[PDB]
Design a protein around this ligand. Structure first.
Ligand SMILES: *C(=O)[C@H](CCSC)NC=O
Lengths: 46, 271
RNA sequence: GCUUGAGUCUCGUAGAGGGGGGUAGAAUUCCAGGUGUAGCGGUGAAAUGCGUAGAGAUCUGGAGGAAUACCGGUGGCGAAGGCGGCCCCCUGGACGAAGACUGACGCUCAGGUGCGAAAGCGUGGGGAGCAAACAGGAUUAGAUACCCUGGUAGUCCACGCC
RNA sequence: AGGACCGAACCGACUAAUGUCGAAAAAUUAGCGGAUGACUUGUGGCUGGGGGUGAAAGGCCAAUCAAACCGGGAGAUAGCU
RNA sequence: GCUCGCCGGAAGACCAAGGGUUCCUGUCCAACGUUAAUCGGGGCAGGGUGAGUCGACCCCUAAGGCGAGGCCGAAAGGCGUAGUCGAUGGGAAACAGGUUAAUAUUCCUGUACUUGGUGUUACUGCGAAGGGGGGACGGAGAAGGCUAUGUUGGCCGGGCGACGGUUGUCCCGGUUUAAGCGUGUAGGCUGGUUUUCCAGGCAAAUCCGGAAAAUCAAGGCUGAGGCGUGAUGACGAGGCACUACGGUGCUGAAGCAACAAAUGCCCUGCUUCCAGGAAAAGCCUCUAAGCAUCAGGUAACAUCAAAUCGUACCCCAAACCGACACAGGUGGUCAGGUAGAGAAUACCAAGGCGCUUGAGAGAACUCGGGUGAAGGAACUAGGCAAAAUGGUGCCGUAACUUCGGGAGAAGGCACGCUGAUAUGUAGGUGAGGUCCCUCGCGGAUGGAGCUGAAAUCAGUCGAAGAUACCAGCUGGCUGCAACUGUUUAUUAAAAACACAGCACUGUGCAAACACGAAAGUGGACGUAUACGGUGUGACGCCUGCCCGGUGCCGGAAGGUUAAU
RNA sequence: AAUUCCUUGUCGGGUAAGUUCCGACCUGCACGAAUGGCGUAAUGAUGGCCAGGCUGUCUCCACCCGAGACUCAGUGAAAU
RNA sequence: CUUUAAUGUUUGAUGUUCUAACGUUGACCCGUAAUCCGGGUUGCGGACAGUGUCUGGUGGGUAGUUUGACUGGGGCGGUC
RNA sequence: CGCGGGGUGGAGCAGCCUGGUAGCUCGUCGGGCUCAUAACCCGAAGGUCGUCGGUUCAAAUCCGGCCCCCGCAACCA
């Protein structure tokens, strides 16, 4: 059985990265909402 | 030649092969080979538009001439080749100036024959001439629609057009399927039937003997569930709806001939 | 060894002998168009069928296929089946004449090999006419027959089989 | 030569047994089929909700699918408990 | 520390992925560990990651994404050109040994290589987002030539041995050496050099390509390995000498021969077949706009520089992914001895571990297995489960058939050890020796050494000799589906699906059709011997009657009939 | 008969005994020609049946070797 | 009134021709080393095609809903 | 159990719905044609309308009871 989750930094950051959000308007909403909430880990990064 | 292979195994048992003892078994000319990544039938968005497309074998495209634009210069059929994405073979000819370029392969042709285009090229299989210099009742191929576009009609193995008449600026053709189109008089054609004349008798024998070519298994409509296709479902193989396509359009007899701006050029449709 | 068997060579004869490739006209059919009008077609009679949307008849043009009138003759040719519009190309057989040359190289032949109408079959083309099967209409005690209107394979083409 | 044969790797998952608060939210053990192919698999992209994908089971789309997940309409509605 | 046991194509040793200090040392034991625990992947403090040659970054592109203008779209935004990103791909360069508690082709020792900057000297035409060559390529299969590496022998060092023999064909341990430089071999590709000419390469061209003669038959390119060198060097079993008894300092013989041999290399070859097998830059070549006492380019030489990031450890697992120290999943590489065809399997080596609860007991019962009198499916929904058949060579083998098969059909025979043929054969490799030569890594020739099946005969032993593990149950009638294959992940692998084949039918190209409100794409850079839809399902023998109802196609006169 | 309710239809074979199976009879509830018909070499982790081999499947179990169950010390859940 | 004939006039309905609207996924050139695109040539179609408003037809391709109750349980039947 | 339909000369079918009147084909009988038969031609005859009751001026017909016959249904667990 292959557990439904294999890690891959490159692939992760190309779909959940900071710039993975800034390329679209929707991402600008997500960056806004998480900031509106007061979250600390906005997106998987350094 | 045609050879029904020996029944050494179930799957090979029903294969018939096209053994061509002429085609150059070396590697083709590089400068006329460009990349050609298959697309499995997916559009710009990425969704599959046409079904049964994909897999296949990695192939490279052979850019060939269609125009026969460099006129007045004779040529020699240096050698024949094999083309993956055609039906007919292609030949690498050489102009007298020293420029090699591919052209399709007409029926009766050997490596070392003479071919040329323009208007001075005589009546021999391979010469390209505008249709106002071609005899009525002749067999041609690679017929153009517009002068200079290149050639569209009759391009596969043994597909030939019989010129009917030449009234005014409208020359009449009789297509391979059976439709009388009337085209521009300056449309360039090429004498003789296209080569690879045994292509029709070739059978595959295997499911894989079609798979590496590019097709995908065709699922019948009656097997699918009613939410998928306008047929199918039912406890125990039922049917009874009017045969259609995956989108409701009645098939098995339903004309969709509608372009209308080409209505003027079509004299007779398929019987 | 000879020459009357048989065979080769020089010159010619007539011929639907055969294979491949071109081409011509009458006729039929179909399609488009003009003229024009109620029947047309068919049979023993009739009906099926076609027709006032406008057939057939008649005139013009075009697209295909098959078969080659008269010549044609119990004529000719080939082993036979079989083969006839004309033409070019490749090519086979027989026969006639004056001599020569080889010098019995012969006659026949189970098995073996090949050719072998049509119908019929495989593969891929072609489809006018004709036409199994089949349908319809009649005749008939009955008629899945003769007769009538349609009609698929087929007949046609190349490679094979039989 | 082969969608050819035998058979490990590898992939898959036919019978039985164990297990069922298990070692494990489908596995282990003994045996099975493919095993040069329509083969297998890594890295990287693409197709997305009445949409995708499908050698087609209404199977699959993050342990969830006869229409995913999250937030919002919304304290939906209930002659029902 | 001494025995015992287990894996050993792994439970071993290294990279990638991913973790994130889990690595080492000292100290501590409440909590964590399914037990205690002075122990530890636990807490606490400290230490550890050293690069011009490894990788990333960088230059260059694939799929595909973003996309100036631009086209389209109610807005958002969609598509896409020029461009620019994007490795799993291509592209410059280092090997061996030593060292620390923990890092090393990164530090030290020795010996080398690559790319640019600048300067000097002697020559000399250089010069692009442009052209050309090159990079640059399929699967499968076979042979030859080698190496990695292992065994054997000689040689060197040690022992002659706690129960019987063992100074001998005895036993134990060792016998390792790279990159770079030089040579250019086995072998592979291809006819070279020269004169002239040209509507070809969106311009030019001395470059390629084409077309004619001249001259000679080689030149050139590529190229594993070996041999020398690297190296009177390092390493090195074993001693010598100090122990904080952890280890260190010192010293140090031989270091060759032969055979067997890979899936590594030559081979990004060769032969063949088809389903016909990235692109670009680096690199080299050629000239244009031009610039030419120049500048630049080339060769040699001196010298400078090559940054930044990662580097510990785990990586078939108590550290990844599964809530856990979880019998699960996880790509790549190296991969020794004997038996054996083999990476199977049995037992071992290097190496790493004894699975984180143990001690007695020897009941029922359950799980995992061993054997079993007589019979032999009488069990049972059913021979499910077990039992059993199980290797090689050889002999032999039916119905049916598409003439390939069925077939490993079925069914049998010899299998051990020892001697002999033969103080080990056929066969293989093959020195010394001899002659030859376009003189070298050469050719005939020569044959010792080394190595080594099978077969035949005889003798002999056990109840049993393919002695273990490993390792087909066979056969007859017959339904269905042609057969390979695919699918209900997680109760259904099947007669279901698919399949090649056939048939109907749509499609004349801005093709039908499909996604998309559109543009634009896919279809196809294909075009009727093509492509889409549908039904059926190899192949063989075929495929009858019905156009009433529905649908489709053809036909339009008339009736009815919408907006206008 | 993957199709036949009545039916286990009738006859024949296989068995000591055969609602299954093989082969035929047509009385086809309600088969049938590309929602393809009837055969078919080979193949199938497929479906039904018989024969041989073979055995603890069974007659009818007994003993044997390990993991637990039982006891001792340590740790210490669960549905309800 | 009807039948008819010439003209004027009224728009309508066919056929052919033309070029300027327009289409051009035809060739060439330039913006530009750019197969998108824009513009300029020129050829071919051509007042068609195509798009928009209105309109009949077809329409499970898609969508929102309906599909009664009584019933000695519901269904069928019967019934209101 | 229930729904629908059918029963008519010797046989097979009209007629019923919308009541007073029963027709068609074959077959039987008789004659003719023929040497004789079939076929053909001409002519004539034959029905309690399954059974019973009722409503009605009048019933094969319209209603209800009964028998026979055909199809459908006879169900979900
Ligand atoms: C009826 O038979 C019923 C169906 C149950 S489906 C879960 N079964 C009764 O035992």
């Amino acid at each position: 059985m292959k557990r439904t989750f294999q890690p891959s930094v490159l692939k992760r950051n190309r779909s959940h990265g900071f710039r993975a959000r800034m390329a679209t308007k929707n991402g600008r909403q997500v960056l806004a909402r998480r900031r509106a909430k007061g979250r600390a880990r906005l997106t998987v990064s350094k | 030649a045609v050879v029904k292979c020996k029944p050494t195994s179930p799957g090979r048992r029903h294969v018939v092969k096209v053994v061509n003892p002429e085609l150059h078994k070396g590697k083709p000319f590089a400068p006329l080979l460009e990349k050609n990544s298959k697309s499995g039938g997916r559009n710009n968005n990425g969704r599959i538009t046409t079904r049964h497309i994909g897999g296949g074998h990695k192939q490279a495209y052979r850019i060939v001439d269609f125009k026969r634009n460099k006129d007045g210069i004779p040529a020699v059929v240096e050698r024949l080749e094999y083309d993956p994405n055609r039906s007919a073979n292609i030949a690498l000819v050489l102009y007298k100036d020293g420029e090699r370029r591919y052209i399709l392969a007409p029926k009766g042709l050997k490596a070392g024959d003479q071919i040329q285009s323009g208007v001075d090229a005589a009546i021999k299989p391979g010469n390209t001439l505008p249709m106002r210099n071609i005899p009525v009742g002749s067999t041609v191929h690679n017929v153009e629609m517009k002068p200079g576009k290149g050639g569209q009609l009759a391009r596969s193995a043994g597909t030939y057009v019989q010129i009917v008449a030449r009234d005014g600026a409208y020359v009449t053709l009789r297509l391979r399927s059976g439709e009388m189109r009337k085209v521009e008089a300056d449309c360039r054609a090429t004498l003789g039937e296209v080569g690879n004349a045994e292509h029709m008798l070739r059978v595959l024998g295997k499911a894989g003997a079609a798979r590496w070519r590019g097709v995908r298994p065709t699922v019948r409509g009656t097997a699918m569930n009613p939410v998928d296709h306008p047929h199918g479902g039912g406890e125990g193989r039922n049917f009874g709806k009017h045969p259609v396509t995956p989108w409701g359009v009645q098939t098995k007899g339903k004309k969709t001939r509608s372009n209308k701006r080409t209505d003027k050029f079509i004299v007779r449709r398929r019987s």
